[PDB]
Write an enzyme that holds these catalytic residues in place. Structure first.
Site, PDB file in Angstrom:
ATOM      1  N   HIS B  45     -37.591  11.102  -7.780  1.00  0.00           N
ATOM      2  CA  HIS B  45     -36.495  11.912  -8.302  1.00  0.00           C
ATOM      3  C   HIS B  45     -36.559  13.388  -7.886  1.00  0.00           C
ATOM      4  O   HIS B  45     -35.838  14.228  -8.451  1.00  0.00           O
ATOM      5  CB  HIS B  45     -36.479  11.855  -9.837  1.00  0.00           C
ATOM      6  CG  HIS B  45     -36.264  10.483 -10.402  1.00  0.00           C
ATOM      7  ND1 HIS B  45     -35.150   9.721 -10.113  1.00  0.00           N
ATOM      8  CD2 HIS B  45     -37.002   9.754 -11.276  1.00  0.00           C
ATOM      9  CE1 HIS B  45     -35.221   8.576 -10.771  1.00  0.00           C
ATOM     10  NE2 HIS B  45     -36.332   8.570 -11.485  1.00  0.00           N
ATOM     11  N   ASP B 175     -34.992   4.430 -18.351  1.00  0.00           N
ATOM     12  CA  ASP B 175     -34.357   3.305 -17.664  1.00  0.00           C
ATOM     13  C   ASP B 175     -34.437   2.036 -18.512  1.00  0.00           C
ATOM     14  O   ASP B 175     -33.487   1.258 -18.567  1.00  0.00           O
ATOM     15  CB  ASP B 175     -34.980   3.056 -16.284  1.00  0.00           C
ATOM     16  CG  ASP B 175     -34.458   4.025 -15.209  1.00  0.00           C
ATOM     17  OD1 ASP B 175     -33.229   4.229 -15.106  1.00  0.00           O
ATOM     18  OD2 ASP B 175     -35.286   4.585 -14.462  1.00  0.00           O
TER      19      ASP B 175
END
Ligand SMILES: [Zn+2]
Lengths: 259, 259
Positions: B45, B175
């Site tokens: 990320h 997630d």
């Protein structure tokens, strides 16, 4: 294009922090989101290059955050380039005489207030300007702050702060405590006596009062009570060391942790 | 030359944090001083280059801190280079099948346990080695950790964790909560049910238990009670945002502050 003096001029209190470690320019966006008005790049005690500063400034200019630089010595190489790149101004360390301030102002201001050279491109943030008006307006926005770290400077403070172009005054508590023969005792009454003397001179000379506190944000109350507008608290390194160490210690103290 | 598995093997609890912003390699010295055993560079990320990682590793190798990397996908380019550069291993994100683990292990281990290519120079930290012994010993020190983020992975967890070479398991709560249809509710009972199921499988398969908590160090107690050795708490960005915002807010709330 310039944010700091506008706030100070409106009588606002403004909040900044020191930058000693991080050079990822996104630190600027983090600082904007945290509500900081400015930060000071430490070129006296750290390795920042002028390119790194340019990167920080490029993000700050549109983020509404002002970048000041603490420079190691007063010369044209530091003052001319950093202002041209887009720092709004300087914290000048260990100021001990009017002459240091006169020289800082001479380098930092366009004629007739000084001898700063007029460049282009990044100087005007790549925008067209009316030169005759623009140099006059910019001279009013450049920020010069004297940092006091010597007993001798405290004694000669009125002379230092009377120099035209000096916007604000602040302290370097560690060096000052050292000069008082009590290095590191930054909460000693003798240190606060110095602060008081300097603040009275700042009032006499119409100079903005600043204050640095290294660790505990609440200790800023003392300066705020006394009308200090330039509030400088802690820094990126202390943030990383203090926050990280605290959590790690909490974890290592959990029941069942196996050292 | 390798620090992490040695600690885990001795039954120790170890503490790490995420690295998403800072690339100044001195962050490694700050983390060592704060008492961290390891940190995880977020290449999934964030923008870290392999050169930046090399810089971090160069400082970490002599500081006694282990560098793991969260890679965006499992291929030779990521696995071979990062191990050669000196990362001790990986957090593999969103692991959903045994096959992903088999492929990670194939790329990460020297023959006969895998097909990792044998290079030189930085590979051995620029030191001479007895190759026949060295590849065997290094294979025992490479660290592979599966990150679980899907309900399907939880259901198939025994198959995932039974793959030879899988050292540890951890969660990606954001997630996972998303996959449960409750994105962001990372303290929901359904999330903890998943954790429990995975921990039971880890116990059955002889795999180290890990846990990530994003904000409050005390919440690590839950994992420590359950024998989790891989403790991953917060990160540099949260440190900077949380610490800085808190102090600024305290300052802006002082009596006499002029907004
Ligand atoms: Zn950095």
């Amino acid at each position: 294009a310039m944010f700091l003096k506008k706030k100070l001029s409106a009588g606002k209190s403004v909040v900044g922090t020191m930058l000693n470690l991080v050079y990822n320019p996104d630190i600027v966006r983090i600082y904007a989101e945290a509500g900081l008005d400015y930060f000071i790049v430490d070129c006296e005690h750290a390795a920042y290059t002028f390119r790194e500063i340019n990167h920080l400034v490029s993000v700050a200019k549109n983020a509404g955050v002002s970048v000041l630089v603490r420079i190691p010595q007063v010369d044209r190489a530091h003052v001319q380039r950093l202002l041209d790149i887009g720092a709004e101004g300087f914290m000048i360390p260990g100021v001990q005489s009017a002459e240091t301030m006169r020289e800082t102002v001479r380098l930092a201001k366009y004629p007739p207030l000084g001898e700063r050279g007029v460049g282009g491109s990044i100087v005007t943030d790549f925008k067209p300007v009316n030169w005759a008006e623009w140099v006059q307006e910019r001279n009013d926005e450049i920020f010069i702050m004297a940092q006091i770290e010597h007993v001798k400077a405290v004694e000669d403070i009125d002379s230092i702060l009377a120099v035209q172009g000096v916007d604000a005054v602040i302290f370097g508590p560690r060096d000052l405590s050292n000069d008082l023969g009590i290095i590191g005792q930054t909460e000693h009454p003798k240190v606060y006596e110095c602060y008081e003397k300097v603040y009275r001179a700042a009032d006499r000379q119409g100079v903005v009062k600043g204050f640095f506190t290294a660790a505990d944000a609440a200790k800023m109350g003392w300066a705020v009570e006394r009308g200090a507008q330039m509030l400088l608290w802690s820094g990126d390194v202390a943030a990383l060391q203090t926050y990280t160490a605290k959590g790690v210690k909490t974890i290592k103290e959990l029941p069942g942790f196996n050292p």
